[PDB]
Design a protein around this ligand. Structure first.
Ligand SMILES: *[C@@H]1O[C@H](CO)[C@@H](O)[C@H](O)[C@H]1NC(C)=O
Ligand SMILES: *[C@@H]1O[C@H](CO)[C@@H](O)[C@H](O)[C@H]1NC(C)=O
Lengths: 248, 204
């Protein structure tokens, strides 16, 4: 009882060809594509009724949608432009026949394809990670210890941060910035930074056999892409920083 | 055509209090439906509540209710007993009932749910890098949910938003915000120097 969409992230240039997939298994016969630019509302692109295009909101031809089955709506992409960077949202809803019942045909949305389209692939950089240890003052005054992890210098701004303690991912006592932060706020193609906090008891941080790892999953170029620099090709990758609990 | 207006861009509620997010609309078609959807950090659009234009039964669904006044063209969302997971971008939306039922979305209103700070201890601590001992960050923590953290006017000093941290082991909640910068003049004493900070804030 949900809509799936793949890929969840996508970085392309102005030459690549790619395709977004949308799938539902509720029996819905109305399917929809919406485009959500950053800090803007979602905007209709396409509507399909019974697998046939009903609405095309003047979407430029380089977007080529397609409905091979009732459960599946594709969007084929080629020759995109940087202004096409957006969150592409799939939706679906019941559509009853003529003279049939009129219910609340609520639209249910997929999780969306985060799409970044670059003028040049030069712009893509992976995060640098560092971990900062809790201060003696904090432990002495709160009997608590707050680690901070900080990812810096990355582009595009879609990364996934998690904390791993003694090998197992933790969720309690975590706080991650809901949104990244521009490092050069006056520039079009700014690189980005994101910070997270993990807070534990004073004893736990002082236990020197406890490991703390901050993990940043970066979404960048895939293997089919063509890198043209002595820098390392920024493939979808994991960058990490670690710290040992210490006796102080 | 259909227009949605959400005047407020951002809201705050204390945990367990109710909040009202405002929405008015215009439509030419006299048969329509009003929607609210929520968008967490994750990025998905979650259906909350629906109100058809001829219901004459003000809508309610879980902790959500809909102040629907057609004469005023208002469709406010009331969220009861706010929980910390309620923080997200809330979108007012509308469709005609007569055609393909495509939604038009408002500009959206961000909601930030705040914890009731059990015992404030506003401090600004300094945290050292585990690799190279010189680089550092500044952590402003444990203050009351009233306090606002402001971006630096300077563009080379990065200041984080408010973040809400829940240690379910401790049954304890705290606010924090992070500051860092590569200028040699930047320290913890001046890091938040253009945000209104409680006077007793501890700087070890
Ligand atoms: C949608 O409309 C635009 C403008 O009329 C047109 O160029 C484009 O090819 C159309 N797309 C489809 C899939 O019909
Ligand atoms: C919805 O709530 C408003 C209060 O803002 C009330 O005046 C209105 O009558 C309610 N709608 C219905 C259909 O009762």
């Amino acid at each position: 009882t949900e809509v799936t969409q793949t890929p969840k992230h996508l970085v392309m240039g102005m030459t690549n060809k790619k395709s977004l997939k949308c799938e539902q298994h509720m029996g819905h016969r109305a399917m929809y594509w919406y485009k959500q630019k950053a800090k803007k509302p979602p905007e209709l692109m396409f509507v399909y009724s019974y697998e046939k295009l009903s609405i095309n909101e003047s979407v430029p031809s380089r977007f080529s949608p397609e409905c091979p089955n009732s459960s599946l709506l594709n969007l084929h992409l080629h020759a995109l432009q940087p202004e096409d960077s957006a969150l592409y949202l799939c939706a679906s809803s019941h559509l009853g026949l003529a003279g049939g019942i009129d219910g609340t045909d609520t639209q249910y949305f997929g999780p969306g394809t985060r799409l970044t389209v670059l003028e040049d692939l030069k712009n893509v950089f992976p995060p640098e990670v560092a971990v900062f240890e809790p201060s003696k003052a904090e432990i002495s005054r709160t009997q608590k210890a707050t680690l901070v992890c900080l990812a810096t210098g990355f582009y595009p701004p879609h990364v996934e941060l998690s904390w791993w303690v003694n090998g197992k991912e933790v969720h309690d006592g975590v706080c991650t910035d809901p949104q990244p932060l521009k490092e050069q706020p006056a520039l079009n193609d700014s690189r980005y930074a994101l910070s997270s906090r993990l807070r534990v008891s004073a004893t736990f941080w002082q236990d020197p056999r406890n490991h703390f790892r901050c993990q940043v999953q970066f979404y960048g170029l895939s293997e089919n892409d063509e890198w043209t620099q002595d820098r390392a090709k920024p493939v979808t990758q994991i960058v990490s920083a670690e710290a040992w609990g210490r006796a102080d | 055509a259909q227009k949605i207006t959400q005047t407020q861009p951002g809201m705050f509620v204390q945990e367990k209090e109710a909040v009202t997010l405002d929405c008015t609309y215009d439509t030419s078609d006299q048969s329509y439906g009003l929607f609210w959807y929520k968008q967490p950090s994750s990025g998905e659009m979650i259906f909350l509540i629906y109100q058809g234009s001829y219901d004459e039964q003000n809508a309610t669904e879980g902790r959500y209710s809909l102040n629907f006044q057609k004469a005023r063209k208002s469709a406010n969302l009331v969220i009861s007993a706010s929980q910390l997971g309620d923080s997200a971008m809330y979108f007012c939306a509308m469709r005609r009932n007569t055609g393909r039922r495509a939604l038009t979305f408002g500009s959206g209103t961000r909601l930030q749910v705040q914890p009731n700070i059990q015992n404030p201890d506003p401090a600004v601590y300094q945290l050292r890098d585990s690799k190279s001992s010189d680089k550092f960050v500044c952590l402003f923590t444990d203050f009351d949910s009233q306090i606002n953290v402001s971006q630096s006017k300077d563009s080379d000093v990065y200041i984080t938003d408010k973040c809400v941290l829940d240690m379910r082991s401790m049954d304890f909640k705290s606010n924090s915000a992070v500051a860092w910068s590569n200028k040699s003049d930047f320290t913890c004493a001046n890091a938040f120097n253009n945000s209104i900070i409680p006077e007793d804030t501890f700087f070890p």
